[PDB]
């Protein structure tokens, strides 16, 4: 008898589960239809509080109104500089929002920096020490600077020939320091709408202040930092103002990287904006050996590798040149259909990359 009873009972259980699913579907439909009745509210920044009830809001890219808070919201927190929603029938204040993130900035924070560790950068030990002393330690241990009473340096400038590790340095600092990181390609700041770039810089620094601890790494600074096309200068002015606005208390630090520091406006060079500078030179003989040993490390090679001979030949290389050396050696091994790598591949690769360096009509670089 139990088989028929089980058939009907299991069908009842299945039907009740199906009815629960159908109930969830009905609640989805009813709830989203109820949402359809809702109407969007107008966003806008606020200004002087004329009275305890009359306020001057300024709708984002819009007119300037005088409006009142709804009935119940706080009035003290309604200070000049609080994003608030406006009812788009009477424009009354309701729902003061925290602040704008400006998804440009969201992209400028939630960007993958890689797994780069300090043990992957080579030959820059002194420069890593400086950067960690100016940007990591003031953030990790602010109480040191509190008790000592020293105002920590606001930011560091990284400069050097193209392909020596500046961007790598920033990548490592981002990947190792558990904080909020802001990386910027400076040309990304540039926009064709009137005065939008200055707003972008202001909002970036406001996000920096809102989400401490944070590091701001604007790269290729010369793009918006060249010596005094109009909007770029007006935006450099806003960058200067926001930089000088750094009170001693924020856990906010900043890195700027460039390959042509000479073109940089001397305004930045003044102490109090970017004081500490670091020259990331072409790797030394020992530095070149370190860089090569790091990059060629994971290569499945056989036999002895004479890194010192390659370093002897690799005069004047950057780090990218040595990374190439490894890549070209691997490419030669692949062409020869060898599942492995040996010394001759490295020899051929370094000779090839030297021939390439012949093309790279590397100008003499002079610092700031």
């Amino acid at each position: 008898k139990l088989l028929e009873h089980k058939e009907i009972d299991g069908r009842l259980k299945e039907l009740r589960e199906q009815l629960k699913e159908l109930t969830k579907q009905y609640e989805k439909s009813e709830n989203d239809l109820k949402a359809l009745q809702s109407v969007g509210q107008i966003v806008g920044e606020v200004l002087k509080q004329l009275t305890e009830e009359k306020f001057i809001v300024k709708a984002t890219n819009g007119p300037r109104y005088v409006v009142g808070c709804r009935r119940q919201l706080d009035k003290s927190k309604l200070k000049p500089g609080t994003r608030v929603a406006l009812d788009m029938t009477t424009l009354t204040i309701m729902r003061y929002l925290p602040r704008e993130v400006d998804p440009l900035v969201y992209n400028m924070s939630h960007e993958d920096p890689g797994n780069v560790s300090y043990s992957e950068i080579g030959g820059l030990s002194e420069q890593i020490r400086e950067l960690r002393e100016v940007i990591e330690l003031p953030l990790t241990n602010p109480e040191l600077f509190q008790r000592v009473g020293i105002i920590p340096p606001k930011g560091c400038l990284l400069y050097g020939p193209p392909g020596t590790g500046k961007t790598l340095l920033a990548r490592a600092v981002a990947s190792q320091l558990d904080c909020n990181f802001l990386k910027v390609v400076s040309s990304s700041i540039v926009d064709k709408y009137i005065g939008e770039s200055a707003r972008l810089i202001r909002e970036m620094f406001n996000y920096a202040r809102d989400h401490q601890p944070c590091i701001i790494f604007m790269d290729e600074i010369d793009a918006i930092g060249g010596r005094r096309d109009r909007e770029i200068q007006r935006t450099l002015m806003e960058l200067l103002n926001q930089m000088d606005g750094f009170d001693t208390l924020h856990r906010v630090k900043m890195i700027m990287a460039t390959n042509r520091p000479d073109t940089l406006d001397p305004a930045l060079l003044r102490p109090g904006r970017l004081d500490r500078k670091i020259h990331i030179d072409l790797p030394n003989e020992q530095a070149r050996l370190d860089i090569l040993k790091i990059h060629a490390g994971p290569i499945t090679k056989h036999g002895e590798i004479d890194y010192e001979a390659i370093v002897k030949l690799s005069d004047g290389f950057n780090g990218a040149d040595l990374r190439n050396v490894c890549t070209e050696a691997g490419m030669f091994a692949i062409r020869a259909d060898h599942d492995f790598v040996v010394q001759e591949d490295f020899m051929k690769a370094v000779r090839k990359v030297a021939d390439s360096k012949k093309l790279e009509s590397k100008l003499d670089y002079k610092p700031v």
């Binding site: 039907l15 159908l22 949402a35 490894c326």
Partner: protein
Amino acid sequence: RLLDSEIKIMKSEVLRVTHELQAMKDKIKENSEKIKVNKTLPYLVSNVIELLDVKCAVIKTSTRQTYFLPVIGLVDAEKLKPGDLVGVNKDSYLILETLPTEYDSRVKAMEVDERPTEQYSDIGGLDKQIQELVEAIVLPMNHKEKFENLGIQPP
């Protein structure tokens, strides 16, 4: 004794639940078609900005005016993200469509659709350069195994 203690129970409860299920599915159909008629599309394509709790979104329109939505709308919060493209109601500005991101017309014009036909045999004397370009470009696209077995970054 057996099978007689449940006859009146199994033969009526399931029928009632089935009737309720039929009526409830009908109610779903009406709510869905009310959504459908309320889904006529002049949409005001707009960018999403950071979401809030008190799950609810901020929108920047193509007309360069910002709105807050008490409820995001017919899309789910987990789908959306900052700097997204959403089609919103032309008047109430509620989000009711999620759009594929559009970069620019020129960028799409840069895409090759005709797929030209010049063969490698049509190139003369350049065999070394041909081999260099092929090993640099095509091989990473083709296999990725010969490179990863070596641990090198492909050019």
